[PDB]
């Protein structure tokens, strides 16, 4: 078997597995007034873009032409999304960890009390 054939099979298994997990995740989100934490929404949105940039890097490479083998655009987008997650979100949420745990703890006790 050719090396490309084995490699392409691995991508096929990865892509279908990712799609199935995406199918589950979207369905759970679609099932979900409740207002969310803007930081953690930005945290969720930021790394989602990082996955897209990683997938764009996969897409650029997968093309047989390979006009941009370095995937500069996919890199820059991944670079942006990685930076916000690490340098911006993490210091803030660390300051916010104490209060965030307090609220999540509060509901669990209410949930146990309700049951």
């Amino acid at each position: 078997m050719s090396e490309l054939n084995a490699l392409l099979k691995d991508i096929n298994g990865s892509l279908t597995a990712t799609s199935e997990s995406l199918e589950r995740l979207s369905g759970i989100y679609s099932n979900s007034p409740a207002e969310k934490v803007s930081l953690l929404s930005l945290k969720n949105g930021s790394m989602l873009g990082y996955i897209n940039s990683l997938l764009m890097l996969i897409g650029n490479r997968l093309d047989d032409e390979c006009k941009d083998p370095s995937a500069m655009d996919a890199r820059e987008r991944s670079i942006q999304h990685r930076v916000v997650l690490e340098r911006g979100v993490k210091p803030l949420e660390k300051k916010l960890a104490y209060q965030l745990d307090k609220l999540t703890r509060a509901y669990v006790k209410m949930e146990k009390e309700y049951k």
């Binding site: 207002e35 803007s38 300051k95 916010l96 104490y98 209060q99 965030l100 609220l103």
Partner: protein, 395 residues
């Protein structure tokens, strides 16, 4: 409603204090630096907004931020300005002008419901109070000033026709505020001042407070010594506390003979241990104890003294022959000069501390520790055998 809550606070506030009831109320209400905190049980929504009874009440007074120029002028003149007890006291004792500039809060009073004492509510309140000033209680939801009586109203009113009424409930803020609502003031340390007792010291010791000053003259009314302990909040420079803690320990060790001889060996030992905890607070190795040098050992003890010690460790000598060397050995051990090689148990530390520093007799320690004199002498001998072996290893 406010009066009912105020009565509940003051009963808790007045729960344990010695007859100085009246004036403090005028201090709480009028004084600007003073702030009041209350620990309340969980609020049942089914109660329709009824006030729960306070478990713990803490009164803090903001202190510090004194201009360095004012400190120098007053210190030279020897005049103590009203308020700011801890900043003035530390500056006088340590002659440090930087400390007075630091912003801090003094815990004026902490009171817990006596029926509920020792259940850990007081420790909880301090922990929350420290977290509050550390900035952890940030607002998670995405004004409280009141208009004063204007001069126009004062000029337009006639004495006979004055309608002096309670302020409208709409203008007033809520009686109880969440910590997140009101931002804290920036503080560098938390300070306490109290008479040193085993119970109170253990309470503050467990709350990460470090002793910095102990008054030599006992208070006439209580017979207790005023002790000032400091706590540094996270993210703020902590070196200055370590230097003060080291100096206090040296002062304490030498002063055990003069005026703290009355203190029990266990109480004195605990005070040293609490101060050492400040050194563990500093992860830096810049300020460290220095192990005894051979040249410095020679100066302290002549070769005959070392020979005399070894004979006693071998039981070839009487206890009295070595009585002269004990206080110097105590200073070296409790000064941490001997290092990791030599370590002693709590009882052995009490025995060495009593003979070496308090200068108590061996029989007196036997009574205090509820040990026979035979055990006390034997345990003391084991201390010197360890100490002697250390000197041999250095040599």
């Amino acid at each position: 409603v406010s009066e009912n809550f105020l009565e509940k606070m003051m009963a808790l506030y007045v729960s344990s204090h010695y007859k100085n009831s009246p004036n403090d109320l005028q201090l709480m209400s009028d004084a600007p630096a003073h702030k009041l905190f209350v620990l309340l049980p969980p609020i049942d929504p089914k109660d329709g907004g009824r006030i729960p009874d306070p478990l713990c009440v803490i009164q803090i007074a903001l202190e510090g931020e004194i201009s360095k120029e004012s400190v120098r002028n007053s210190l030279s003149r020897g005049q103590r300005a009203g308020g700011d007890l801890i900043p003035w006291l530390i500056s006088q004792q340590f002659q440090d002008e930087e400390f007075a500039s630091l912003s801090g809060a003094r815990i004026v009073r902490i009171a817990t419901n006596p029926e509920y004492a020792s259940m850990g509510y007081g420790s909880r309140a301090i922990e929350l109070l420290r977290d509050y000033f550390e900035g952890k209680f940030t607002d998670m939801s995405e004004d409280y000033s009141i208009k004063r009586v204007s001069d126009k109203e004062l000029a337009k009113t006639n004495l006979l026709k004055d309608d002096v009424k309670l302020r409208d409930a709409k203008t007033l803020p809520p009686l109880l505020l969440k910590l997140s609502e009101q931002p804290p003031h920036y503080l560098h340390y938390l300070g306490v001042s109290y008479g040193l007792t085993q119970s109170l010291h253990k309470f503050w010791k467990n709350n990460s407070f470090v002793p910095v000053y102990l008054r030599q003259t006992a208070n006439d009314l209580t017979g207790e010594h005023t002790c000032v302990m400091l706590n540094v909040l996270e993210g703020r420079e902590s070196n200055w506390l370590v230097e003060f803690a080291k100096d206090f320990r040296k002062r304490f060790l030498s002063l055990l003979s003069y005026d703290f001889h009355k203190f029990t060996a266990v109480q004195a030992l605990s005070v040293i241990e609490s101060s050492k905890k400040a050194q563990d607070l500093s992860d830096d190795e810049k300020h460290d104890n220095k192990e005894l040098t051979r040249t410095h050992l020679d100066d302290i003890f002549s070769p005959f003294d070392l020979k005399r010690l070894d004979s006693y460790s071998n039981n070839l000598l009487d206890y009295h022959v070595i009585g002269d060397m004990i206080p110097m050995l105590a200073l070296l051990y409790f000064g941490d000069k001997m290092g990791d090689s030599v370590k002693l148990s709590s009882v052995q530390s009490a025995i060495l501390l009593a003979i070496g520093l308090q200068r108590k007799n061996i029989d007196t320690i036997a009574k205090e520790l509820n040990l026979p004199s035979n055990q006390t002498i034997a345990m003391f001998a084991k201390i010197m055998r360890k100490m002697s072996q250390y000197f041999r290893q250095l040599l």
